[PDB]
Amino acid sequence: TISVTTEILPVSMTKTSVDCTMYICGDSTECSNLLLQYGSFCTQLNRALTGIAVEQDKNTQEVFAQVKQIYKTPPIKDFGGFNFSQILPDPSKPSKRSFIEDLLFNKVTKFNGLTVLPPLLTDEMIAQYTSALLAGTITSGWTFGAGAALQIPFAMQMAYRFNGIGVTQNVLYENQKLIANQFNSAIGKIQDSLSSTASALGKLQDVVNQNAQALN
Amino acid sequence: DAVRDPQTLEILDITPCSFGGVSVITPGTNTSNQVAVLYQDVNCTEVNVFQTRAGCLIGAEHVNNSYECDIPIGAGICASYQTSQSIIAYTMSLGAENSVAYSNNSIAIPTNF
Amino acid sequence: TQQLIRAAEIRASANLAATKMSECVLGQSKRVDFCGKGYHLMSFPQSAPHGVVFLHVTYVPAQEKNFTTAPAICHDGKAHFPREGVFVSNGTHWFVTQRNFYEPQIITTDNTFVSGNCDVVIGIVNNTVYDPLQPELDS
Amino acid sequence: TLVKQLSSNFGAISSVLNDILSRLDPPEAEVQIDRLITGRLQSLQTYVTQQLIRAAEIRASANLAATKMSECVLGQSKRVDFCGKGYHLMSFPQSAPHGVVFLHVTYVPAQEKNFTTAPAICHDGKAHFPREGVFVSNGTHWFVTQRNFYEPQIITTDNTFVSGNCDVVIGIVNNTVYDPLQPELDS
Ligand SMILES: *[C@@H]1O[C@H](CO)[C@@H](O[C@@H]2O[C@H](CO)[C@@H](O)[C@H](O)[C@H]2NC(C)=O)[C@H](O)[C@H]1NC(C)=O
Numbered sequence: 001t002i003s004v005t006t007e008i009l010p011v012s013m014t015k016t017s018v019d020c021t022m023y024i025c026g027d028s029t030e031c032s033n034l035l036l037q038y039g040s041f042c043t044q045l046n047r048a049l050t051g052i053a054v055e056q057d058k059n060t061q062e063v064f065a066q067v068k069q070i071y072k073t074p075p076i077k078d079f080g081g082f083n084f085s086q087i088l089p090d091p092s093k094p095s096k097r098s099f100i101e102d103l104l105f106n107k108v109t110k111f112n113g114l115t116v117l118p119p120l121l122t123d124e125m126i127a128q129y130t131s132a133l134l135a136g137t138i139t140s141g142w143t144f145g146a147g148a149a150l151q152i153p154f155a156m157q158m159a160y161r162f163n164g165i166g167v168t169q170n171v172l173y174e175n176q177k178l179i180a181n182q183f184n185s186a187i188g189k190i191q192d193s194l195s196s197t198a199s200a201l202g203k204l205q206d207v208v209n210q211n212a213q214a215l216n
Numbered sequence: 217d218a219v220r221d222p223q224t225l226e227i228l229d230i231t232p233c234s235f236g237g238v239s240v241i242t243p244g245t246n247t248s249n250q251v252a253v254l255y256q257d258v259n260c261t262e263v264n265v266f267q268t269r270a271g272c273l274i275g276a277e278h279v280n281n282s283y284e285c286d287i288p289i290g291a292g293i294c295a296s297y298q299t300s301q302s303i304i305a306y307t308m309s310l311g312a313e314n315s316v317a318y319s320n321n322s323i324a325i326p327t328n329f
Numbered sequence: 330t331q332q333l334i335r336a337a338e339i340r341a342s343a344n345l346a347a348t349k350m351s352e353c354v355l356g357q358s359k360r361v362d363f364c365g366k367g368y369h370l371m372s373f374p375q376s377a378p379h380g381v382v383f384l385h386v387t388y389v390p391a392q393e394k395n396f397t398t399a400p401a402i403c404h405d406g407k408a409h410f411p412r413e414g415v416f417v418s419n420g421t422h423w424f425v426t427q428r429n430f431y432e433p434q435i436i437t438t439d440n441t442f443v444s445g446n447c448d449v450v451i452g453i454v455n456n457t458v459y460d461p462l463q464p465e466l467d468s
Numbered sequence: 469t470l471v472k473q474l475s476s477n478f479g480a481i482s483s484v485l486n487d488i489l490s491r492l493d494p495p496e497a498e499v500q501i502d503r504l505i506t507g508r509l510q511s512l513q514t515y516v517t518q519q520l521i522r523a524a525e526i527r528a529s530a531n532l533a534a535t536k537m538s539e540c541v542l543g544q545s546k547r548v549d550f551c552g553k554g555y556h557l558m559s560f561p562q563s564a565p566h567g568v569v570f571l572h573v574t575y576v577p578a579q580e581k582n583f584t585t586a587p588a589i590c591h592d593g594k595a596h597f598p599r600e601g602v603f604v605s606n607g608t609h610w611f612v613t614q615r616n617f618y619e620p621q622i623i624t625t626d627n628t629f630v631s632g633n634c635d636v637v638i639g640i641v642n643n644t645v646y647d648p649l650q651p652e653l654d655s
């Protein structure tokens with residue numbers, strides 16, 4: 001049987017930033033002058049927080065910007081029986097996300113000198129990276145990773161992948177239809193799981209909660 | 217948060233006055249003494265002016281052409297010092313666009329390395 | 330201080346994420362259970378709030394039968410071993426098959442190789458090994 | 469940062485310990501000193517905590533370095549992009565101040581041509597598949613080649629194997645498969 005499984009990882013956290021002076025002695029000259037007597041106690045805090053904020057964007061870059069070229073899928077989805085429609089982008093949306101990306105985005109949910117900086121890459125840009133990755137994977141196999149994207153038929157891609165696990169390639173050809181059917185069904189189940197299981201996204205929800213608690 | 221006026225019994229909200237961090241965007245002084253200033257998380261009101269999600273950016277010229285990111289500002293905006301030279305701001309490119317010719321019976325095979 | 334420590338945990342996670350992408354989306358993996366349970370075929374990434382999600386597709390052997398086996402087969406005093414696969418028996422006849430999927434074949438000189446003799450191998454069994462050349466020369 | 473902190477008063481009359489002691493009696497000097505002790509103690513604790521955290525990052529890096537050395541210099545790696553971009557051949561280490569440098573040598577396919585292909589070839593109703601490589605066509609003739617460099621060869625029974633028949637395989641094409649034994653027996 002062909003089975004399809006979901007693995008979830010955090011990449012990043014919210015880039016908070018704090019004005020040490022304003023928090024301690026907000027708009028008081030008398031307090032500020034006393035604060036000065038502690039030297040650099042203030043500024044070195046500002047520095048530490050900055051360090052964190054920067055690496056947040058570095059993290060994102062290392063995971064997603066893995067492909068030098070933005071490849072895009074052909075207009076004809078003739079991938080030998082395998083249906084890719086729930087993982088490829090949806091043209092009709094204001095942000096070109098796949099169906100399953102939308103489910104994921106719908107599952108995860110002051111004046112004391114405490115502010116929040118935006119991330120460098122927008123949701124839309126991350127989505128374009130994923131798209132390039134997926135277009136690559138589908139039409140050129142692993143080649144795009146070594147160097148240039150060399151096209152190959154989907155079915156032939158799979159025959160190599162079968163040899164990789166020690167199953168003779170005739171098996172894939174002779175059972176083409178069953179394999180495509182199993183594939184298609186497994187993806188259907190992923191939708192059902194994601195759409196119904198709140199706990200599916202717990203690993204991401206936890207990060208959000210820890211940071212919120214820290215500020216409160 | 218809010219107070220009742222002691223003379224006339226109405227309720228007034230108290231909202232603390234606008235404030236925000238200031239960033240200075242600069243190519244090294246070994247090249248130029250010219251700079252652009254970003255007022256974080258404010259509108260171009262209180263403060264060659266470009267309103268971004270990062271705040272109010274003043275001094276940078278807004279350009280239509282995308283490029284590789286140089287000095288990052290935020291929310292997909294980067295700045296650089298280019299041509300005579302001045303500071304410019306643009307939406308960053310992700311890279312070169314390249315469709316792959318896929319067909320049910322075609323393979324590309326490399327001939328050299 | 331709390332933020333610094335927490336940030337460290339996230340960065341470790343980010344490095345792992347980046348590593349799956351490279352050795353899993355952009356290829357196939359023989360590191361076990363690294364890319365989900367089963368034998369890995371391929372993976373597809375999808376984005377999410379503050380992280381990434383990975384759909385792994387794998388191959389899982391499904392239904393199975395109890396067969397009798399042997400390490401080697403004796404022919405003319407010669408010990409024949411399979412080049413690939415396993416000598417199996419249905420109770421009456423010996424076949425050679427691949428390991429991951431039952432696909433029985435006739436034992437021939439193109440399926441086996443010869444090394445040494447009958448007196449060494451523990452559990453060696455007697456059978457016959459067909460020579461595909463013989464009938465070409467015979468006719 | 470640590471050094472400079474010494475010059476702070478932390479609310480004492482002076483950052484200079486001797487100046488307190490040379491001007492105040494013990495009952496008063498003790499108060500002033502306690503202010504400096506508090507400030508200085510705090511300063512060291514801060515420094516040490518930062519060093520512990522930073523040290524952790526370095527150790528993680530050191531472990532990765534050690535791992536490349538083993539699975540890259542001492543071997544050849546099929547973990548992708550682990551030892552530079554391309555297919556890894558070999559690596560050479562060179563030392564540097566507070567670290568190591570790794571020169572990776574890889575192999576990158578370079579120039580390429582568009583050929584027509586098929587999953588299988590029909591002969592006498594039999595389906596022939598390549599043992600290694602791909603059936604390719606130049607537009608008029610079918611060859612079998614390795615998957616990484618164009619080395620076209622004649623399709624023969626020593627290049628392919630037979631399994632099943634023509635009625636199953638989608639996109640199966642007709643050709644001829646040469647038998648190298650035939651001319652040995654023919655002559
Ligand atoms: C791939 O699968 C989806 C179903 O998950 C197909 O989309 C459906 O198409 C039918 C019409 O045949 C509609 O009634 C459904 O509303 C569609 N569902 C969704 C979720 O879009 C899709 O057409 C399939 N592609 C192929 C070529 O088989």
Ligand SMILES: *[C@@H]1O[C@H](CO)[C@@H](O[C@@H]2O[C@H](CO)[C@@H](O)[C@H](O)[C@H]2NC(C)=O)[C@H](O)[C@H]1NC(C)=O
Binds near residue numbers: 327328329
């Ligand atoms: C493969 O690529 C190399 C280029 O990297 C080619 O080698 C060149 O050959 C010509 C002679 O025809 C010389 O003028 C160059 O100086 C060579 N360059 C190098 C670095 O050797 C070679 O022709 C190509 N070979 C194949 C197999 O097509």
Ligand SMILES: *[C@@H]1O[C@H](CO)[C@@H](O[C@@H]2O[C@H](CO)[C@@H](O)[C@H](O)[C@H]2NC(C)=O)[C@H](O)[C@H]1NC(C)=O
Binds near residue numbers: 419420421422
């Ligand atoms: C072991 O394998 C052989 C070969 O498939 C089986 O023998 C064949 O049985 C069928 C009847 O079902 C006959 O038509 C063939 O002529 C037989 N071939 C030979 C070589 O005798 C045998 O029955 C199998 N044993 C079991 C119990 O499955």
Ligand SMILES: *[C@@H]1O[C@H](CO)[C@@H](O[C@@H]2O[C@H](CO)[C@@H](O)[C@H](O)[C@H]2NC(C)=O)[C@H](O)[C@H]1NC(C)=O
Binds near residue numbers: 403454455
């Ligand atoms: C496998 O077949 C050989 C015959 O080819 C058997 O060899 C015999 O072994 C016994 C015990 O030493 C001798 O007494 C016979 O003289 C041998 N026969 C020949 C023809 O040399 C071998 O024992 C067989 N194994 C089984 C369990 O059947």
Ligand SMILES: *[C@@H]1O[C@H](CO)[C@@H](O[C@@H]2O[C@H](CO)[C@@H](O)[C@H](O)[C@H]2NC(C)=O)[C@H](O)[C@H]1NC(C)=O
Binds near residue numbers: 606607608609
């Ligand atoms: C496809 O491959 C064959 C074999 O190399 C080519 O046919 C040969 O062409 C040359 C002329 O350049 C002749 O001297 C040979 O006698 C031909 N052999 C055969 C079997 O006919 C053929 O030209 C190739 N097609 C293309 C367009 O490259």
Ligand SMILES: *[C@@H]1O[C@H](CO)[C@@H](O[C@@H]2O[C@H](CO)[C@@H](O)[C@H](O)[C@H]2NC(C)=O)[C@H](O)[C@H]1NC(C)=O
Binds near residue numbers: 590641642
């Ligand atoms: C490949 O060659 C075989 C002949 O060896 C073709 O088989 C024919 O198929 C049609 C359609 O069912 C029949 O009407 C003929 O009777 C078959 N011929 C023979 C001799 O059996 C097959 O169609 C060929 N494929 C192509 C596209 O050329």
Ligand SMILES: *[C@@H]1O[C@H](CO)[C@@H](O)[C@H](O)[C@H]1NC(C)=O
Binds near residue numbers: 247
């Ligand atoms: C910096 O400026 C000096 C002139 O004072 C010059 O010698 C040097 O080459 C410059 N370096 C760079 C990298 O611009």
Ligand SMILES: *[C@@H]1O[C@H](CO)[C@@H](O)[C@H](O)[C@H]1NC(C)=O
Binds near residue numbers: 258259260261
């Ligand atoms: C700036 O002020 C205008 C009203 O003059 C308003 O329409 C706009 O949304 C404001 N922008 C931001 C980001 O505060």
Ligand SMILES: *[C@@H]1O[C@H](CO)[C@@H](O)[C@H](O)[C@H]1NC(C)=O
Binds near residue numbers: 280
């Ligand atoms: C870019 O070009 C459009 C016309 O297509 C124009 O309206 C706009 O002002 C230009 N923007 C910049 C940044 O120059």
Ligand SMILES: *[C@@H]1O[C@H](CO)[C@@H](O)[C@H](O)[C@H]1NC(C)=O
Binds near residue numbers: 393394395
């Ligand atoms: C093999 O034999 C044992 C006999 O006790 C049986 O319990 C088992 O189910 C058999 N296994 C398979 C996979 O048929």
Ligand SMILES: *[C@@H]1O[C@H](CO)[C@@H](O)[C@H](O)[C@H]1NC(C)=O
Binds near residue numbers: 451452
């Ligand atoms: C297998 O085990 C049985 C004992 O149950 C014994 O008779 C036979 O010799 C053994 N064969 C091998 C290959 O060890």
Ligand SMILES: *[C@@H]1O[C@H](CO)[C@@H](O)[C@H](O)[C@H]1NC(C)=O
Binds near residue numbers: 317
């Ligand atoms: C293969 O065919 C297409 C036709 O549009 C062409 O653009 C492309 O350059 C060809 N590829 C190679 C590697 O020759």
Ligand SMILES: *[C@@H]1O[C@H](CO)[C@@H](O)[C@H](O)[C@H]1NC(C)=O
Binds near residue numbers: 320321638639
């Ligand atoms: C390949 O695609 C074309 C349609 O463009 C079709 O005529 C042909 O039957 C297809 N062959 C296979 C192997 O799917």
